[PDB]
Amino acid sequence: LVRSLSPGDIVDVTGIFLPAPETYLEAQFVKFASFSLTSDVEERVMELITSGDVYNRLAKSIAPEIYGNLDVKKALLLLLVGGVDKRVGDGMKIRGDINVCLMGDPGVAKSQLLKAICKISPRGVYTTGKGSSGVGLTAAVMKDPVTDEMILEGGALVLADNGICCIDEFDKMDESDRTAIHEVMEQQTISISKAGINTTLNARTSILAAANPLYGRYNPRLSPLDNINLPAALLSRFDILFLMLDIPSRDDDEKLAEHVTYVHMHNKQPDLDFTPVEPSKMREYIAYAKTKRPVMSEAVNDYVVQAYIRLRQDSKREMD
Amino acid sequence: TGRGSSGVGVLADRGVVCIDEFDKMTDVDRVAIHEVMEQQTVTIAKAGIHTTLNARCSVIAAANPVHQNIALPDSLL
Amino acid sequence: SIQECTTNFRNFLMSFKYKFRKILDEREEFINNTTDEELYYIKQLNEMRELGTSNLNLDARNLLAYKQTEDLYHQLLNYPQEVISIMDQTIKDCMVSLIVDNNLDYDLDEIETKFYKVRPYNVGSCKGMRELNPNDIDKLINLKGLVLRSTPVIPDMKVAFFKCNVCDHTMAVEIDRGVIQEPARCERIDCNEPNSMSLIHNRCSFADKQVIKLQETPDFVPDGQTPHSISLCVYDELVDSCRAGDRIEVTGTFRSIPIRANSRQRVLKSLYKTYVDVVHVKKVHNEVEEVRQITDQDLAKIREVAAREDLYSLLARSIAPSIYELEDVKKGILLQLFGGTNKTFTKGGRYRGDINILLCGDPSTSKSQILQYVHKITPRGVYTSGKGSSAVGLTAYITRDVDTKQLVLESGALVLSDGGVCCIDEFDKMSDSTRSVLHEVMEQQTISIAKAGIITTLNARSSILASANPIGSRYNPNLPVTENIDLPPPLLSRFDLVYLVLDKVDEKNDRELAKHLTNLYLEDKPEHISQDDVLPVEFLTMYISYAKEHIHPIITEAAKTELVRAYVGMRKMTTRQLESMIRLAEAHAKKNVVELEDVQEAVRLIRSAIKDYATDPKVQTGKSVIQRKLQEDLSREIMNVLKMSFNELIKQISSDIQEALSRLQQEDKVIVLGEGVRRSVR
């Protein structure tokens, strides 16, 4: 059974507790792919499919204390599932993760949306920007107090493998903290070369950052690239770039104030047109959909090419 | 205190925390203060220790001038 | 058995030819009747007597070729502790038989007293450090790693020296199995005093012992694991032969020594310290006489592709079948893997033959994907970032051992890649202290570090393949190249190929690029592409390593004349551009000579980036005539003949030549009359 325990796995080690005249454990017997296809779990998944409108039900069940932002909550549902990891036989590994970044004025409940997706995902790690520097984000090369060996302690991008990485305050980060981010969004790897350890660790996480303007509020008179202290190279790697602007409106503020008072009174969500999905059953539907690998159709390939031409022509005319 | 208590050094659950000289403290220690007052919990994930310590204490302090007169970011206000 | 292994090894050294080694290696098309029929082990035994050596480089692959030595080769890998001792005795009796058969007037006592040792290497059991099973105690296992550090020679006592304190009686007691049997009483009859012998360590015969720390090869370490290390023990005269940053092949026994729990007690722990006793050192003293890599059957397929005229286009598509277009970019990277030869000089300076390519333009244009593909092909290639590695991680960081607590010197990203291509990401985001170090690596291929009183020069001969990026992540067409990128002017002149891959918005290019990327995701294997169009990864690595060890192009007089004329014309529109065209033309033919067609291809690659500009950085039919002047130029020679073949028109006066002939055919001015000759109008 030796040479079979990988660092970072969650297994059930079975053994005996024998003391040493120090207490050791003599090994006797030793993620999304570990959940078995139980008949009781499969019955709960089919109950949501026969109900109808599964895409709109799960999009509104997330964050019950946040009213509005129907389009913003739709992108968070696909982040828990994601695309397929088509591995080319030549040696190319196409990244199937989605890179979504939330922007706007700090008042659209940005901290609540990052913590809501962390508790739902089984392997999600929430962190900030200034509190976690380049050592806490990548990997800390500490010294072992027993064997005196330089190990590699997992940080935020290592322990959250095959999950969603929640990063808060993306604009207040340093220049040395964006080094490993450029490698995860391209090759899903972390290049470490400290203390004579030149190893590469895989990081297949879903980066969900939340940028903030430099002048607090957004300025429509200035360019979108100058208002946010972020280069154009990082915006090209992000798939979706939202911008929740806090526009003052008498109709939106009236519906938002009534939803807040109802939460702080009954400790629940207002009664809508459907029953809220518990987080215990939502994890079973996401893990079941990850095993299914959809294949792109041939008739839909012509619509993707035609959509890229119209999108590139509109962006070229809006350069000035 | 502000110039004595850093970000490393929870113990006062459901109470009050009196910090002296808030403006004299560095910007590194002010990050953990805003994170512990948002959800009344401290999410520490360092050295392989992922524990969610509850900190439901009211953070109160008294700063001094040097938005412009306070010299504090918008995340702290 | 002792008598069975004696007669088996004696007849093997007296009846062995080079044809047996070619049978197991599938070599039946290149067998000579004058050199392979002669005995190879006989010439090696005759040279040992003339030179006076005492070590034989026995090849383990030769035992498997002979059918009578099949059981002998299996017993050597099992427990060579008793097999090597037999080979040391059989080689002694064979040496005496050669003297009687030759009848020479030499001293027979001086030859029999010399203890000969056999050094077997290159076995079939090529197990790594992770596959070291516990049942392989005292077994010769070949290891393919890299040398990390080097320890000084430690003396090992072999023959103890004793001397009495009363009668002064010097004695010599040999150590057996690490046991020093001290005499209880004196051997002299007049003395005979117990506990009167003194051990003099200054008069003992010590042996050489060196400890070498070997690191595992990253090509065999799986993804997600850290490469471990092991301890090596070098004895005899093989010490001081392995330096830091050298790829060797250790094929020695796997012994083990127990450890003590306390320095004052005689107790022992349950764990045993494992160490590999080095027997032979084969680099990847003495020298390698020949190598038998790959297969001769694969050499016929190598020469088959070399005979084809479409070699420059077939290798350019197989190096990156997932990236569309970029034909001019892939043609330069292909020459970087090969590269020009290294004409070493004794009284002259060392010239760098590597090709330094720098990628520029807008990002998100498959720039980071190229750096990830060359690293997987090169066996010593690395992948680093800009801000992730400063001027210390690339050079040599002063680390410390976690066993001896001593100041050691570990290699960096530029030292571990001794012979490959270094891929550096985000070259424009490097610090000022890191850009100054690369000035010496791209010129003399040496890294001179003078820190903490240690002024040493480290050798680093490798190519640099990086990708630059603009400041605002957008290459503006109305800005110079030196202003768009924050790279130093001296750093831009040190490179050989400065490609500028732009992201131009084109409807005809985005439509074909989307269809190529969609076909890779639909089917895992390219069924539409034939097998003769895309070469596998295993065959591409065998074509570069074979040409870089035997093919050596020589610049002739015709090739050197065009290189001087091309260098003068480029300046009329630095010396670093002249050396770039030499390595580019030599790698295109790597042919034993440099033809005129290989030199013309290197100028096209250089002119692809340094053109369309002169005093300022940043259609041809009517404005730039050409078509208007060629109609009166080509027709002038045709009219003079009537007052011809297609090959005679070019020599008397070729894409524009055929285009002008098709224009006159539509206006009823010339007659085709076949592709052979041409006819004018009546």
Chain A residues with beta carbon closer than 8 angstroms to that of B43: 126
Note whether C139 and C243 are same-domain residues. yes
Token duo for residue C501:
């891959």
CB contact under 8 A, A193 and C388: yes
CB contact under 8 A, A86 and C385: no
Contact C381, C424 (CB under 8 A): no
CB contact under 8 A, B35 and A216: no
How many residues are present in chain B? Answer: 77
Chain B residues with beta carbon closer than 8 angstroms to that of A140: 47
Helix or strand or coil: residue A242?
A: coil
Alpha helices in C449-536 (DSSP H): 481-484, 489-493, 507-522
As annotated, the binding site of A for ATP includes: 67, 107, 109-111, 212, 237
Note whether C238 and C109 are same-domain residues. no
End-to-end Cα separation, chain A, in angstroms: 65
Q: Mind telling me how many Å the CA of C549 is from chain A's nearest CA?
A: 27
CB contact under 8 A, B38 and A111: yes
Residue with tokens 């994907």: C369
| Interface check A127 vs B, CB under 8 A | yes
How far is C-alpha A192 from the geometric centre of its chain's CA atoms?
23
Sequence-ordered list of residues with C-beta below 8 angstroms from that of C392, at least 6 positions apart, any chain? C412
Sequence-ordered list of residues with C-beta below 8 angstroms from that of C661, at least 6 positions apart, any chain? C634, C670, C678
Task: Measure the CA–CA gap between A298 and C519, rounded to whole angstroms.
Answer: 10
CB contact under 8 A, A232 and C520: no
* Residue C304: how many other CB atoms lie within 10 Å: 9
Alpha helices in A82-178 (DSSP H): 110-120, 134-137, 156-159
Helix or strand or coil: residue C208?
A: strand
| Interface check A146 vs C, CB under 8 A | no
What are the boundaries of each domain within chain A? 38-320
Q: Which of B35, B48, B74 sits opposite A131 (nearest CB)?
A: B35
How far is C-alpha C416 from the geometric centre of its chain's CA atoms?
12
Note whether C194 and C152 are same-domain residues. yes
Task: Measure the CA–CA gap between A189 and C179, rounded to whole angstroms.
Answer: 54
Chain C residues with beta carbon closer than 8 angstroms to that of A195: 399
Q: Which of A126, A131, A153 sits opposite B31 (nearest CB)?
A: A131
Chain B residues with beta carbon closer than 8 angstroms to that of A210: none
Note whether C115 and C132 are same-domain residues. no
| Interface check A286 vs B, CB under 8 A | no
Task: Measure the CA–CA gap between C606 and C560, rounded to whole angstroms.
Answer: 17
Q: Which of C368, C393, C474 sits opposite A187 (nearest CB)?
A: C368
Half-sphere exposure of A252 (CA within 13 A, CB side): 10
> What separation in angstroms does the CA of C317 have from each of C209, C310, C527?
52, 11, 16
CB contact under 8 A, A131 and B43: no
Task: Measure the CA–CA gap between C506 and A308, rounded to whole angstroms.
Answer: 11
- The string of DSSP codes covering C127-179 is --STT--TT-TT-EEEE-EEEEEE---EEEEEEEEEEESSS--EEEEE-BTTB
Best residue in A90, A99, A179 for a mutation probing chain C (most C CBs within 10 Å):
A90
Count of A–B CB contacts within 8 Å?
Answer: 33
Contact A103, A242 (CB under 8 A): yes
Note whether C119 and C240 are same-domain residues. no
Q: Mind telling me how many Å the CA of B38 is from chain A's nearest CA?
A: 8
Contact C17, C38 (CB under 8 A): yes
Token duo for residue A226:
């100058």
Instruction: For residue A91, give the nearest of C554, C486, B67, C520 by alpha carbon.
Output: C520
CB contact under 8 A, B43 and A126: yes
Pairs from C401-404 (Cβ < 8 Å, separation ≥ 24): C401/C149, C402/A148, C402/A149, C402/A150
Experimental technique of record: cryo-EM
| Interface check A230 vs C, CB under 8 A | no
Helix or strand or coil: residue C354?
A: coil
Sequence-ordered list of residues with C-beta below 8 angstroms from that of C14, at least 6 positions apart, any chain? C39, C41, C42, C94
Task: Measure the CA–CA gap between C212 and C234, rounded to whole angstroms.
Answer: 8
Instruction: For residue C498, give the nearest of C376, C392, C617 by alpha carbon.
Output: C617
> What separation in angstroms does the CA of A308 have from each of A296, A298, A299, C249, C325?
17, 17, 16, 54, 19
Helix or strand or coil: residue C247?
A: strand
Task: Measure the CA–CA gap between A301 and C518, rounded to whole angstroms.
Answer: 8
| Interface check A197 vs C, CB under 8 A | yes
User: C545 φ, ψ to 5°?
Assistant: -70, -25
The set of chains that have 3 or more CB pairs under 8 A with A is B, C
Q: Which of B43, B48, B74 sits opposite A106 (nearest CB)?
A: B74
Note whether C78 and C91 are same-domain residues. yes
Chain A residues with beta carbon closer than 8 angstroms to that of C520: 86, 88, 92
Rounded to a whole number, what is the largest CA-CA distance in chain A? 78
Chain B residues with beta carbon closer than 8 angstroms to that of A155: 45
Burial of A133 (0-12, 13-18, 19+ CB in 10 A): middle
User: C626 φ, ψ to 5°?
Assistant: 60, -65
Q: Which contiguous run of DSSP H or E holds residue C30?
A: none
Helix or strand or coil: residue C255?
A: strand
Task: Measure the CA–CA gap between C43 and C37, rounded to whole angstroms.
Answer: 13
The set of chains that have 3 or more CB pairs under 8 A with B is A
| Interface check A128 vs B, CB under 8 A | yes
Note whether C93 and C140 are same-domain residues. no
End-to-end Cα separation, chain C, in angstroms: 99
CB burial string A18-35: b at 16+ within 10 A, e below: eeeeeeeeeeeeeeeeee
Note whether C130 and C119 are same-domain residues. no
- The string of DSSP codes covering A163-220 is SEEEE--STT--STTSHHHHHHHHHSEEEEEETTEEEEEE---EEEEE---TTSS--T
Task: Measure the CA–CA gap between C148 and C213, rounded to whole angstroms.
Answer: 6
Task: Measure the CA–CA gap between C204 and C579, rounded to whole angstroms.
Answer: 58
How far is C-alpha A178 from the geometric centre of its chain's CA atoms?
17
Domain that includes residue C153, residue range:
126-284
Best residue in B26, B41, B43 for a mutation probing chain A (most A CBs within 10 Å):
B43
Sequence-ordered list of residues with C-beta below 8 angstroms from that of C42, at least 6 positions apart, any chain? C13, C14
Of all residues in chain A, the one with the smallest CA distance to C375 is A91
- The string of DSSP codes covering C375-415 is HHHSTT-EEE-STTS-TTTSS----B-TTT--B-----TTT
Task: Measure the CA–CA gap between C294 and B51, rounded to whole angstroms.
Answer: 56
Best residue in A92, A135, A174, A229 for a mutation probing chain C (most C CBs within 10 Å):
A92
Which CATH fold topology does A38-320 show? Rossmann fold (3.40.50)
CB contact under 8 A, A191 and C388: yes
Q: Which contiguous run of DSSP H or E holds residue C191?
A: none
CB contact under 8 A, B45 and A127: yes
Give the strand pairing for B41-46 and B49-54. antiparallel
Of all residues in chain B, the one with the smallest CA distance to A168 is B35
Note whether C109 and C216 are same-domain residues. no
Chain C residues with beta carbon closer than 8 angstroms to that of A295: 522
Best residue in C369, C392, C521, C541 for a mutation probing chain A (most A CBs within 10 Å):
C521
Best residue in B27, B28, B35, B39 for a mutation probing chain A (most A CBs within 10 Å):
B35
Task: Measure the CA–CA gap between C496 and C465, rounded to whole angstroms.
Answer: 10
Chain A residues with beta carbon closer than 8 angstroms to that of B70: none
Give the strand pairing for C382-384 and C421-424. parallel
Q: Which contiguous run of DSSP H or E holds residue C338?
A: helix C327-338
As annotated, the binding site of A includes: 67, 107, 109-111, 212, 237
Sequence-ordered list of residues with C-beta below 8 angstroms from that of A150, at least 6 positions apart, any chain? A141, A142, A143, A144, A195, A196, A197, C402
DSSP type of residue A284? H
Task: Measure the CA–CA gap between A110 and A100, rounded to whole angstroms.
Answer: 13
Token duo for residue A198:
């030149």
CB contact under 8 A, B45 and A125: yes
Instruction: For residue C518, give the nearest of A247, B12, A140, A94 by alpha carbon.
Output: A94
Q: Mind telling me how many Å the CA of B16 is from chain A's nearest CA?
A: 23
Chain interruptions in chain C, by residue before each (C–N > 2.5 Å): 284, 573, 590, 618, 643, 653
Contact C446, C458 (CB under 8 A): yes
Task: Measure the CA–CA gap between C477 and C618, rounded to whole angstroms.
Answer: 5
Of all residues in chain A, the one with the smallest CA distance to B76 is A106
DSSP type of residue C485? S
